Amino acid sequence: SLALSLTADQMVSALLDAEPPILYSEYDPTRPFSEASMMGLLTNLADRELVHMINWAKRVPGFVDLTSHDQVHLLECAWLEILMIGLVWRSMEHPGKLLFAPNLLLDRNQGMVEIFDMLLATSSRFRMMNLQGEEFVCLKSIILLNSGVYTFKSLEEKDHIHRVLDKITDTLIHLMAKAGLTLQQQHQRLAQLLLILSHIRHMSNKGMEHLYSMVVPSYDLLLEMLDA
Amino acid sequence: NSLALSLTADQMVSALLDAEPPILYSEYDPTRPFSEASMMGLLTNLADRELVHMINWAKRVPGFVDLTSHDQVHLLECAWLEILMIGLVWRSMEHPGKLLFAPNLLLDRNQGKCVEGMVEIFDMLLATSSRFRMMNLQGEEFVCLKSIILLNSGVYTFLSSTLKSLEEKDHIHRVLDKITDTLIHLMAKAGLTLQQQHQRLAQLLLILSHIRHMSNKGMEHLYSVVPSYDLLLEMLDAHRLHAP
Numbered sequence: 001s002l003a004l005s006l007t008a009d010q011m012v013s014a015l016l017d018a019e020p021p022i023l024y025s026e027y028d029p030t031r032p033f034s035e036a037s038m039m040g041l042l043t044n045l046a047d048r049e050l051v052h053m054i055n056w057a058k059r060v061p062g063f064v065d066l067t068s069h070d071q072v073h074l075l076e077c078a079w080l081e082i083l084m085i086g087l088v089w090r091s092m093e094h095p096g097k098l099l100f101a102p103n104l105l106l107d108r109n110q111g112m113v114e115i116f117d118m119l120l121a122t123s124s125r126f127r128m129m130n131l132q133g134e135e136f137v138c139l140k141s142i143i144l145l146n147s148g149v150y151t152f153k154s155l156e157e158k159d160h161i162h163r164v165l166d167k168i169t170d171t172l173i174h175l176m177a178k179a180g181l182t183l184q185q186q187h188q189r190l191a192q193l194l195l196i197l198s199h200i201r202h203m204s205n206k207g208m209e210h211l212y213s214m215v216v217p218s219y220d221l222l223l224e225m226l227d228a
Numbered sequence: 229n230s231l232a233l234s235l236t237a238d239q240m241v242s243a244l245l246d247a248e249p250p251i252l253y254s255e256y257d258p259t260r261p262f263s264e265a266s267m268m269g270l271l272t273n274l275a276d277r278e279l280v281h282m283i284n285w286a287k288r289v290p291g292f293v294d295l296t297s298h299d300q301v302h303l304l305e306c307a308w309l310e311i312l313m314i315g316l317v318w319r320s321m322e323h324p325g326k327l328l329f330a331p332n333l334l335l336d337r338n339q340g341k342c343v344e345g346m347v348e349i350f351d352m353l354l355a356t357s358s359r360f361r362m363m364n365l366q367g368e369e370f371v372c373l374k375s376i377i378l379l380n381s382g383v384y385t386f387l388s389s390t391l392k393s394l395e396e397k398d399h400i401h402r403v404l405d406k407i408t409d410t411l412i413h414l415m416a417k418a419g420l421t422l423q424q425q426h427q428r429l430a431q432l433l434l435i436l437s438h439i440r441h442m443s444n445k446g447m448e449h450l451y452s453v454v455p456s457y458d459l460l461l462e463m464l465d466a467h468r469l470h471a472p
């Protein structure tokens with residue numbers, strides 16, 4: 001695959017170009033706040049974000065080398081983690097608030113609040129680490145390829161995914177070396193970034209558990225969206 | 229404030245190997261075949277006995293006893309099932325297609341069906357054991373990973389705004405950095421290239437996301453027996469018991 005031939009710079013350029021835009025909520029600012037429903041707005045936003053995520057996934061180097069079945073399985077496993085890391089990234093520069101959209105910026109009180117606090121904690125960790133956009137797009141691609149890989153031609157698929165994950169590792173280390181980090185700082189920061197992925201997994205599972213208590217894209221919906 | 233951050237990679241590995249808990253046995257001669265009740269009964273009895281030894285292990289993980297009793301319990305509340313699960317996956321590595329719960333309790337996929345919906349988690353644990361076998365995970369790496377689960381799982385859910393809480397969080401991140409250095413040291417000693425070292429570090433830590441997922445699924449299925457704050461605090465304190 002041409003994906004395994006990419007330099008760190010080509011991988012970063014690919015991922016930056018594939019980035020979805022930041023979407024707005026359908027919140028009409030000329031209309032009062034009590035017209036707007038919070039779960040209503042977020043569902044509508046997530047549904048629009050999912051179309052963008054599908055087209056983003058297809059542009060992640062190596063992803064379209066997989067079978068349609070394997071693509072859907074990785075998306076089924078990663079979609080809420082991908083939504084959540086996007087939210088945390090957008091919220092970084094707004095301490096104590098979650099920027100769901102530029103027109104839906106919420107503080108803790110207006111949140112449910114269990115997950116809010118976990119997302120705020122992740123945003124604070126990214127701010128403390130000074131997470132860079134080039135690092136963020138690498139981490140979001142790792143979530144896509146890693147989340148579903150341990151729950152799968154299948155041997156060849158898994159091998160291909162692990163080789164693309166290794167290329168993303170090389171890319172993260174290259175970015176850190178370019179930024180002037182020592183070898184020791186490079187490995188410490190690589191580990192700090194990847195350990196936050198365990199917290200995003202945890203938040204996604206809690207989020208799934210809360211969704212059921214209070215929308216989830218099916219295998220078939222994701223397959224149809226990939227084929228479209 | 230402590231000597232934990234002063235350890236070398238070699239001293240850290242020695243500390244973690246020495247702290248390793250014992251392998252326990254399941255109840256001898258349980259009635260087979262299992263019901264859902266009797267299978268859950270056996271596994272609960274094993275996990276409850278393992279939890280005592282995990283607390284003693286936790287106290288010997290460098291830096292853990294530098295935290296407040298409250299922060300120690302918080303990390304254990306968040307990590308205990310992940311710690312039990314990575315232990316099970318480690319024990320099961322040399323038994324493809326089976327989970328070695330205990331030396332006297334070796335179960336294949338079909339026996340997981342006795343408790344709906346526990347075959348799902350069985351398959352995920354078997355997949356993790358296969359991944360560890362594929363990576364040739366070493367004992368020195370396994371003890372590092374188990375310590376990372378203990379320190380990492382609960383660290384992002386201390387939300388407090390005291391100077392002490394900031395200092396606690398900073399201390400945990402510094403111990404986690406020393407364990408990272410220790411993993412890299414082990415790989416460099418084994419003769420891996422810098423590129424191979426970073427790739428293997430990332431492969432090991434990404435499997436921790438899968439263990440978190442299994443732990444959450446496990447909890448979600450249990451709800452559809454969890455050690456209390458008070459039980460964990462009593463076990464940490466290890467106060468002398470009044471005679472029966």
Ligand SMILES: O=S(=O)([C@@H]1C[C@@H]2O[C@H]1C(c1ccc(O)cc1)=C2c1ccc(O)cc1)N(CC(F)(F)F)c1ccc(O)cc1
Nearest residue numbers: 038039042043046083084087111112115116207210211215
């Ligand atoms: O986990 S939550 O359920 C959920 C997951 C996350 O938050 C909600 C959400 C969602 C997703 C799909 C969908 O169809 C409806 C919502 C997210 C989301 C994330 C990023 C993104 O770009 C778009 C959507 N949550 C907690 C919280 F703390 F407030 F976040 C919540 C939120 C509001 C609310 O009234 C009740 C709960």
Ligand SMILES: O=S(=O)([C@@H]1C[C@@H]2O[C@H]1C(c1ccc(O)cc1)=C2c1ccc(O)cc1)N(CC(F)(F)F)c1ccc(O)cc1
Nearest residue numbers: 268271272275276309312313315316343346446450453454
């Ligand atoms: O396995 S379980 O998921 C469970 C969760 C996980 O494993 C068990 C658990 C635990 C939980 C509480 C406790 O007091 C004793 C053990 C953990 C564990 C993990 C690793 C380890 O080395 C030691 C203990 N299971 C039955 C099934 F068929 F096996 F699935 C079940 C358990 C509890 C429950 O409330 C409902 C269902």
